[PDB]
Design a protein around this ligand. Structure first.
Ligand SMILES: CC(C)(COP(=O)(O)OP(=O)(O)OC[C@H]1O[C@@H](n2cnc3c(N)ncnc32)[C@H](O)[C@@H]1OP(=O)(O)O)[C@H](O)C(=O)NCCC(=O)NCCS
Ligand SMILES: CC(C)(COP(=O)(O)OP(=O)(O)OC[C@H]1O[C@@H](n2cnc3c(N)ncnc32)[C@H](O)[C@@H]1OP(=O)(O)O)[C@H](O)C(=O)NCCC(=O)NCCS
Lengths: 437, 437
């Protein structure tokens, strides 16, 4: 019988997995998977195998895998966009949730379903309209998404005491609704702040999520949308260990609904040391250009970089807590630029920084990863198509990141993952424990 | 020379600690402090020694310690309130930050300084006023605090590239400002939602934080305020392992400012499995009373409890992820009730549940901790003094929790704790790792 629907494919998957993990655990749960040292406890779990997080895994040399699907693999296999060359973010979502590579037909369903669900409640539209213009786009986003929780189906089934065993099904509704709304929140922000007077207009059921987004942003450039598909897809997910994913995961585990847990993830992504580096790169470049001037040398270029390190500041967009090579999401962005915007001054600068920064970082002998990460390359692309308002960039990272984070949330919950609740120590107790005892 | 100021006492403390940890780590950082099993990874870090968290530590038998200061110890040593019998929350804060038991004189400074800082920006006052009346108080709180980030001194010193080494000093300003504002946010919510038409009025520099709070709530009862001091103090902090503290800690570590990280902590506290149990207890009791009727027997009382367990629901306010006995914060609440409200029907019910629940939980053979936690006893006290709007209760938990969470944030940052970034695995990789490899 019938046609397409991810929640049924989920319904079929979940029990098989539920069984799979229980055998595995019934046999291998005792197994020491690794040890904890005291440096690990002071180093922010650096090295720690903390979680189980299904929808992707980060390799220190290779970089991310979406099943065992590398970014090059995703680039060629996922459905493009019916006259395009970038993966549709939709079918990354389907991959993530389902482990399977979508069919064209699956993805139109995703597109159209996200379009169906895409509406904003009057109060969120109110709040958005009154927000101050010195309130950071990330702050605006987060607030909105916390406010939207009003409309959580989960939070309402939970208050009405459902059976634990149907949590996922409700957490799936909210996730699918969150994802649909998100570009309406985001594009309302961009529109209030930077396009005063104008409206985000109507979502068209015949477009893909990316295109309706760029339309609501007000971008007509064909290639911008393509840039958009590629952007939203590579920023999707980055294992569970990273602050934003781990936040949602943590807060999720207390059975806070999908809006609440996502907006917590947002006040993580707005960390300078996290997704706010997007922005931070461009502010840094921009200053470099002013302060260090137009067409600098590899010798002056280094003077600028040392003036930062010598100031007890960080060089944005460089380094990573797990990758030990160049981010493939960096390479992927570089390719695009080589392809579409090669003569762009800012690009040429970012390409010359790649020549210099990792050697300066290697010289300083501090950084364990002197190589660039996604954030190093992202803003230069946006800049090019007239997206010059760099304080908003993290919100795009934010819209994309929902895809990975809410894909896992549905599994977390369909697998019945507990309250994440580690143990803590004070240095005092630590000092007495390992040595004193 | 001169008079009182915590930031100088901090300034003196920090280097000593900074040195202390570096020796300790230079010598004992290698030390295996514990191991990770695969059950631990699927059990939400249950058992895992994750973090270093200074301001308190949770013992599984004894329960919390604020230095090595147990709740009974705090009850007798901390400055009361110049004609009271409950610890002033202020001097719990001083203890937490400084490790020292405050002097009366320290605490008046705290009181008066918190009063100084206590103002809300027009936009937050706007947003608050427009919020819908079906938007949960916790959602309202969180949103507001994310919105307040506008006013972060940290976030502005960071954009202006300070030296890493002065982070704490800015993170101290914001924390002290957050804590001051908080009861103005909270009391504005209570006032809009439940007291329509009326205003929170003016903070008086001669009152303590607790009293200005109860005044803004509109409570005149002397004993209510005392209840307030005791409440705000025992909910302060609960090591770093718990969702709310761990959220702020996580998001904090990305150098998200103290408002952002706190409101993330809030969408954690609004987890049913976390601080929302406050509320959940009272909804459960209230139903019990309706559904199971006024003065029930120990036999019918058990029928109600089984109808919940048999429904794949949880019994609220019972259990804990680390304590293996009755929460001392439970006992402490029970004492108060014995003292002030012994004939209260709801109390008598909560006292009879203590008789029955842990035996029903012990029978079901599921719960590792069949004993009550703070949330089991809290709402019954509020109820009594006319605070009957149980959807707000978690916000009180929320105001109190800022004290522990922001005390640690200043240390985290003055000690230069890194980005919290554990490693994740999918079951797939896990299955291949321990056994397959
Ligand atoms: C992602 C990041 C947080 C990795 O954290 P990490 O794993 O703890 O970093 P490492 O393991 O490499 O070791 C950290 C040391 O190297 C230095 N380091 C790491 N990245 C650096 C960078 N890009 N520039 C300068 N120094 C850096 C730090 O000074 C630190 O020294 P410390 O112990 O004296 O504090 C990141 O490398 C960083 O701190 N900065 C870049 C983040 C970014 O893009 N920021 C933009 C906003 S300014
Ligand atoms: C704090 C809490 C999350 C502890 O988590 P934990 O350490 O993972 O729980 P445990 O180690 O005791 O083991 C959990 C098992 O015991 C049961 N359990 C724990 N607390 C229970 C409670 N109060 N009522 C019923 N069952 C409970 C769970 O069914 C679970 O079974 P499962 O593996 O089939 O899912 C808590 O005990 C809980 O789940 N519920 C109470 C939280 C609360 O106050 N909620 C109010 C809103 S309804």
């Amino acid at each position: 019988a019938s046609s397409t629907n991810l929640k049924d494919i989920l319904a079929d998957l979940i029990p098989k997995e539920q069984a799979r993990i229980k055998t595995f655990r019934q046999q291998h749960g005792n197994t020491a998977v690794g040890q904890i040292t005291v440096d690990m406890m002071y180093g922010g779990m650096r090295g720690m195998k903390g979680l189980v997080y299904e929808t992707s895994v980060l390799d220190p040399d290779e970089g991310i895998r979406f099943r065992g699907y590398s970014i090059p693999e995703c680039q060629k296999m996922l459905p493009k966009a019916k006259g395009g060359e970038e993966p549709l973010p939709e079918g990354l979502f389907w991959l993530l949730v389902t482990g399977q590579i979508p069919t064209e037909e699956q993805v139109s369903w995703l597109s159209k379903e996200w379009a169906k669900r895409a509406a904003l409640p009057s109060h969120v539209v109110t709040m958005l309209d009154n927000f101050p213009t010195n309130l950071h786009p990330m702050s605006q986003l987060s607030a909105a998404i916390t406010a939207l929780n009003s409309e959580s189906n989960f939070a309402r089934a939970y208050a009405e005491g459902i059976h634990r065993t149907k949590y996922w099904e409700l957490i799936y509704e909210d996730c699918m609704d969150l994802i649909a709304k998100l570009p309406c929140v985001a594009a309302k922000i961009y529109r209030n702040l930077y396009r005063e007077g104008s409206s985000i207009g109507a979502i068209d059921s015949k477009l893909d999520w990316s295109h309706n987004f760029t339309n609501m942003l007000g971008y007509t450039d064909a290639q911008f949308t393509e840039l958009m598909r590629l952007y939203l897809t590579i920023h999707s997910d980055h294992e569970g260990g990273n602050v934003s994913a781990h936040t949602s995961h943590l807060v999720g585990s207390a059975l806070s609904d999908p809006y609440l847990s996502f907006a917590a993830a947002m006040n993580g992504l707005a960390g300078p040391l996290h997704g706010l580096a997007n922005q931070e790169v461009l502010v840094w470049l921009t200053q470099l250009q002013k302060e260090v001037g137009k067409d600098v040398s590899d010798e002056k270029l280094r003077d600028y970089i040392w003036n930062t390190l010598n100031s007890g500041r960080v060089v944005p967009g460089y380094g990573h807590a797990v990758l030990r090579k160049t981010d493939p999401r960096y390479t992927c962005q570089r390719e695009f630029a080589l392809k579409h915007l090669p003569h762009d001054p800012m690009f040429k600068l970012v390409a010359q920084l790649y020549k210099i920064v990792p050697n300066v970082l290697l010289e300083q002998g501090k950084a364990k990863n002197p190589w660039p990460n996604v954030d190093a390359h992202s803003g230069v692309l946006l800049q090019y198509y007239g997206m010059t308002e760099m304080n908003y960039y993290t919100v795009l990272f934010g819209v994309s990141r929902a895809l990975g984070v809410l894909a896992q949330l549905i599994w977390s919950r369909a697998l019945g993952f507990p309250l994440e609740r580690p143990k803590s120590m004070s240095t005092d107790g630590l000092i007495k424990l390992v040595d004193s005892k």
